[PDB]
């Protein structure tokens, strides 16, 4: 999922192609103001989709969820489907 | 009354209305994305000495 969102953070235009000083002096100083925050938000971005190592600690908040779900009193891979399934079997027979 | 004749602008408020932000450096582009791909040399290459392919796609023995 890190790389669906790294790909689009591969199609960011190049806004170091505008750090020159004839778009410096060219622009509006609240327009390029914005346009600086705008970089800095960048890298705010793309340093922590490349954070990988904090993929290993977040599938352990999925984990203890997932595995008491799978303790089951009835069984690990019960479902609403084969339950419902089994309900039509136990009232459309005789009690 | 020879301070009326001068300009009322100081040059004080020249330098911050010329200087109003201070400019991105050339080379804080590369340190930025050098120390951010450094980490996908780590995780993802084969040859780190962190790789994340024996975390995410455990080997069969």
Known sequence: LSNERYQLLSQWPDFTTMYGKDFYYRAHPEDLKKFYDAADEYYKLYETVTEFDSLSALASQVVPNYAARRRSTVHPAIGSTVADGAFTNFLLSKQ | ?61
């Open chain 2, 1 to 61: 009354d020879r301070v009326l004749s001068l300009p009322a602008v100081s040059k004080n408020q020249v330098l911050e209305n010329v200087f109003h932000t201070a400019p991105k450096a050339p080379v804080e582009h590369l340190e930025k994305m050098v120390s951010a791909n450094s980490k996908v040399y780590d995780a993802l290459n084969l040859q780190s000495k962190r790789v994340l392919i024996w975390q995410v796609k455990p080997a069969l023995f």
